[PDB]
Amino acid sequence: VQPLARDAMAYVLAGGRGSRLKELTDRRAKPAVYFGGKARIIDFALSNALNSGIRRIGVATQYKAHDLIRHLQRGWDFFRPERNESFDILPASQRVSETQWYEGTADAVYQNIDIIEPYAPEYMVILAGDHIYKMDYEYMLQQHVDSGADVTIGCLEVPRMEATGFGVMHVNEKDEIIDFIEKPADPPGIPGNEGFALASMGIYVFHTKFLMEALRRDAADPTSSRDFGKDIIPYIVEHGKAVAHRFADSCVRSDFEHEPYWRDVGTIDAYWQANIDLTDVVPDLDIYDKSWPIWTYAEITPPAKFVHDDEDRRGSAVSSVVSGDCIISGAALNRSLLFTGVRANSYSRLENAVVLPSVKIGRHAQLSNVVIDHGVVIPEGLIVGEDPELDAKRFRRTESGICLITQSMIDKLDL
Amino acid sequence: VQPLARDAMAYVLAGGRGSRLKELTDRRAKPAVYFGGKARIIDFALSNALNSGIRRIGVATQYKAHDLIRHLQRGWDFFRPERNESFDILPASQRVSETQWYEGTADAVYQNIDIIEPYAPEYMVILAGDHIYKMDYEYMLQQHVDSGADVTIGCLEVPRMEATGFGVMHVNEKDEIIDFIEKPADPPGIPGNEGFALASMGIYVFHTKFLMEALRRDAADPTSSRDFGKDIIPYIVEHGKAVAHRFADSCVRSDFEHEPYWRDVGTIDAYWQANIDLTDVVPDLDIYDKSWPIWTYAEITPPAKFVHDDEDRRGSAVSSVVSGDCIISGAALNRSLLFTGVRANSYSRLENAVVLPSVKIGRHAQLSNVVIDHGVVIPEGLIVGEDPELDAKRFRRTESGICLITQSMIDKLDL
Amino acid sequence: VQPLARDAMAYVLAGGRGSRLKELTDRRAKPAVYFGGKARIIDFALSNALNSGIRRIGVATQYKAHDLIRHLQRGWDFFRPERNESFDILPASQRVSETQWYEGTADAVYQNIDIIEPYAPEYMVILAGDHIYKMDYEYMLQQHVDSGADVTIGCLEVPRMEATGFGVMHVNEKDEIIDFIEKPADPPGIPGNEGFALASMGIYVFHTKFLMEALRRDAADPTSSRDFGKDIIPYIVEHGKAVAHRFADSCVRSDFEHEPYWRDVGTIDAYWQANIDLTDVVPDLDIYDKSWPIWTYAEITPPAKFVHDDEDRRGSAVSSVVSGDCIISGAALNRSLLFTGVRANSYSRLENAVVLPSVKIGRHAQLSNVVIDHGVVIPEGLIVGEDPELDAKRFRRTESGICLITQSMIDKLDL
Amino acid sequence: VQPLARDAMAYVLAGGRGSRLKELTDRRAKPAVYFGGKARIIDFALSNALNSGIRRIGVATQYKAHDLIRHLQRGWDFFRPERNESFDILPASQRVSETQWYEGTADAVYQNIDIIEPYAPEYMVILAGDHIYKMDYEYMLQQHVDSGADVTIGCLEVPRMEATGFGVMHVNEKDEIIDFIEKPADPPGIPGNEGFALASMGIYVFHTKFLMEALRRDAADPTSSRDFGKDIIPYIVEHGKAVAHRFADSCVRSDFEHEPYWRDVGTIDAYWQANIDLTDVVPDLDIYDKSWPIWTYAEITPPAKFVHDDEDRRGSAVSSVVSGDCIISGAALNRSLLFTGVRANSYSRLENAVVLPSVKIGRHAQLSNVVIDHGVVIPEGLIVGEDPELDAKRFRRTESGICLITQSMIDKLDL
């Protein structure tokens, strides 16, 4: 009768460096990266835990975490322990530690068992903090207890050619994991649906007591790189019972989302695409869904403003999404996403632009196919997107032609 | 040495019905009317008290107060008594009286004395809750203390011809009030500067013990209409000492505000004018000023979205202010201010439009010079601002061509 | 799979005057009556709904409810609509109704249908807000959906002689209600257990749309006194399907509670008894339980302090419960419960005393078997509990010897 | 005109080890040590800034301050940047720096200049976060700007023999500092009263721009140990102007505090004494003063409970302070201070005991003249305070007879 989320703790691995996002993550961990206009990536998993009814959340942090920790401290500040709610921020440090960082994703939980055991949750819900997706974890929890599994693993149903870039679960007709393979050149297909392979999401459910014993034996193992995907999980698939849970079963799909939505935004192109796709008439991700809302940190902000309408300048946005506290003053916006605080000045033009918070666009600048980092001041008259070899020498530029622009890159300019 | 605001409490009168605002205040008192894109009228006085350092606030309410009380409960909820802050909502009901409503502005303070005296503030700052202005009440506090006045009155400096519609304080050369005239045909000028008269703002400062003793005499006097402006203050001007405080000395002007800003928005024209002027390139009210911020009730909302760009339709805003959670779908906005949550659909057009929260504009509608009430659903193809005689018959149309449109007006059409 | 409480709105009936509490409810509704040392009575129903996972709460109050509304504003202020939470305070008022009073328990919901319908909850959980008990409403929701009932009713299983003051359900083989009798002088008994009767808790579960329709039918019928127990429920017992849910199946019992706990505290004796029993070594109600906590309004308070220890006076408490902000200054406390903020001075003695917040006990006063109302100042040397005839003349005194003491009574006296 | 606290940023140095508190700070920084029954030491300085009107607070901690940072996250969480409030937690780390450690008190501010300067405060109020005192910083701000000093230094007026442990400021008739000597064996006195000497409170006021330039002067000097007391303060007395502000002018004294109160509880003796003194009839520190309240992290806790009263046992507290969620089960308490959550079981005795949160006293245990660490479980029948030689063998014992007891010592115990 009782929901099992009542007795579960969500534990979010938020130590991801996000290496292939390059300078976008030079001073932030990937879970702290802005997404979608107002939120950060970490907010999806946290909101899934919230919307699912989980009232104890732990977040393990690591690489360049001040920015993530501060966002966590003020967006996620409303859990009250007297109501059996908790939100613990757990950066690798010198606690019982006194040895720098976490040795791996399993160590990120092991080091904080002293936090978990007093709460005594019945179930642990391990989550990757660096993906955008909406999911109701109570489905996973019921499957796990109904199946008698030692671990239940969330998996996407992906066409097997696309599955080559994934950790792939080899499943029988009972959906038991009979093998796990890192990045198979030929991914094992699902029995009876061999065009698709199951791609591990990095979402794991255990009984808390089993997991604590498993972490402890892993910690005593010198062989171990102290990682779920490489050490913990392969052990269970061999000598224990590992079961696959299908994202399509638990994904929360608004009526305006044509398929289960999940994005890794692991490269600059992917990050640009997922943000820019929110400018579509019918986006893949419905940021207007009220049924499974995404909480994040937000401030009371003034509204967006458009000024100037003369022969030579008009402030306007077309096929764009514009956040609060944006002043579009004689600037022409097309197919662009502006986060909070942006200032675009007269005669500047933006096309195919992902513009992070508090950016300033100087007069006469013209930019196409760009990601502009937080707080960048674009100088007057700057042109991006016209000359590929000039843009490549000045900025981080993808093969497909997207330019990521940081303040340090601007600072090095006078051509 | 100590700032006097520590020992002051603000008392806001928010029973004002907004009569000449007509259907706009049929379902909500004037202080609860929306202004500027996000806030409500009452948030200005409240934010003034907060920014000036006043830690105790009471608000007297009366006429259709549910919206007002719901706004105060949800937005002004962060005061903690252990920190010697308080925020009291004081409607009229079955208190220590128990039958009817408040008898007047002074009665609205006298009925709730049992709440004031336990706080024992040294100063009462009496404020009207139905005007838009920014004021640092610390200046008025120290003038009252240093003047020995029984009451210090906030007064606007106004060219005499426009002072004919105000309560006007006839003042001497020490700025002491020697008479008070309700709407003088030829308002007495300021001595030595006879082009200007002093218009009462309805802002009154007292020592608390004097105010209580004065409120009790008024309550005893069965001939009193139980009002500040017409009973109490006319007595102190005669037998006591009343001193005027000039708005210009304490007004908080942004760098981008060309003069002290104060608006009553008492008419549909004044209300339309004050909102629409926020679409100016240089507005008189700088709503982006961060040095004296206006607090209000706000929720996390999605950003604003502009969509469709073909030969028949383009979603976009020009010379316009658009709040969050607005979707401009193939609609063309110009010189318009949209509060939060508006949906404007394909082929619709808005010009000189003040659009309150949650409005839906049907496809192909075209509206010019309008105030659209909260929640109104505009039917497909509706035209306003083309035929004055038809517009006047369907809705409330001002002397100047502004149409106020309410849901009940929309229900009556189709005949 | 999904918890039923996700789709429910708890609607708390908090209009009840509790007239048999006499002077205890003269200046506050019964749901605002303090209980247990910190909380108020309404806090149990509200905490039950919170702990059961219901995210939408409405509370119906009267207009004699300034105390109750202030408590809900300050204490139940942490719901955010963006997270699909809502807390609605619904007093009887002139919203779109003109009249300022609710006709009865059914009308208290009918008048606010315009609030419930936009939320569109799948289920309504109607609760009486004037009882002390702990209950997991998810059980009742699951029974209501699986039984197909038109209304499920929460029922205490009690000996039939004590069922004589309740509304009682006669019920068949499968716990379906075949008849409802109001205070039967000889109540019907359960099949296979005709020694016990099922007495109505005033807790009702409906499918939301059924309830709205039934609430509309009832508002039309002028025979109806506008009540759930008198009108709505008996209607459906006859014409529809009513099923009883037994409190023993969903009561939340701490390990230190020997049976399911529900109390009415409808008489002064019962109120006194329920509070004083908390000073037992093993109380019936475990207020130290963390698994089902009671949320309330609380402030940071200084600790309790006991002072003086000479031949004449000792400040200490024996077999007693003492709250924060309490100074027991040379006073002797035995089997007494002190709410927050009490001051008891030298040579005073309290025994069997339920002492509400902010009470002051003057020196040399001696009080026995009393309930002392909020804020009462006891004069030095007052004796209560030694002279039955004189206590009776001077205070509210029960048949059992408990004296209720209000400030009104204290003032009336020199003898 | 305006209070100067509006333009001030309080900057709290909270890195101190508190080494001569020994095992009491083995895993907590000194500012995070509990004091008074509920608050922690850092809360006083923080509350001073809040009650003084300062709205921007910075707190420098030394990296692995997990208990301190968690305290600030949960307790000091109510500052909203949209209202120009800010509360920043700044641990020594690697964001724009990389040193892993703050090289001194000056370096603790220097490293976070990039946080301070965007706020553009006009004044900096540098505070030591490891002392217990109540002070209104507005008085010190007025004097700093009225006197034109470069630095203004808070100082206590103390007898010279007791000043030998402090940084001492030699004064003149104008209270201008002529020299600063660290720990003078024979301290200079003050003109007109040479029985006393000015001891540095470690509180400094600067004009923000002077301080920034000063911090940049210091960093570029390899001679400097990057310390406020060692380097920057003496620099200015010699070359610039430094002026003494005397605590007695700005200390916030209750009606019941017989002299300005300040403790640095640097020893175990001092810590014990300052806490046990709150058990007095007339304590030096009035923890019941509601006019300069101490804000802290707190939860809704159950009341305190005293149970059992036969000839074998009696649970009671005499001349003691007992916090919430304390259960005194058949335990004898006298002149003891109990923090929240303490459980004392039958036949146990506490005397001259300072008992930190969540301690469990086993049955038959009898402890005298102790400080018991957070969360310690006292074994059944343990005796402390009867054998000085044995107690010294098992615990940390001061010369004066005070035993400090941690769980580690308890675990090492057979005899």
Author numbering:
A (entry chain C), B (entry chain D), C (entry chain A), D (entry chain B): 6 to 420
List sentences quoted exactly from the publication behind this structure.
The allosteric regulation of ADP–glucose pyrophosphorylase is critical for the biosynthesis of glycogen in bacteria and starch in plants. The enzyme from Agrobacterium tumefaciens is activated by fructose 6‐phosphate (Fru6P) and pyruvate (Pyr). The Pyr site has been recently found, but the site where Fru6P binds has remained unknown. We propose that the ADP‐glucose pyrophosphorylase from A. tumefaciens have two distinct sites for Fru6P and Pyr working in tandem to regulate glycogen biosynthesis.
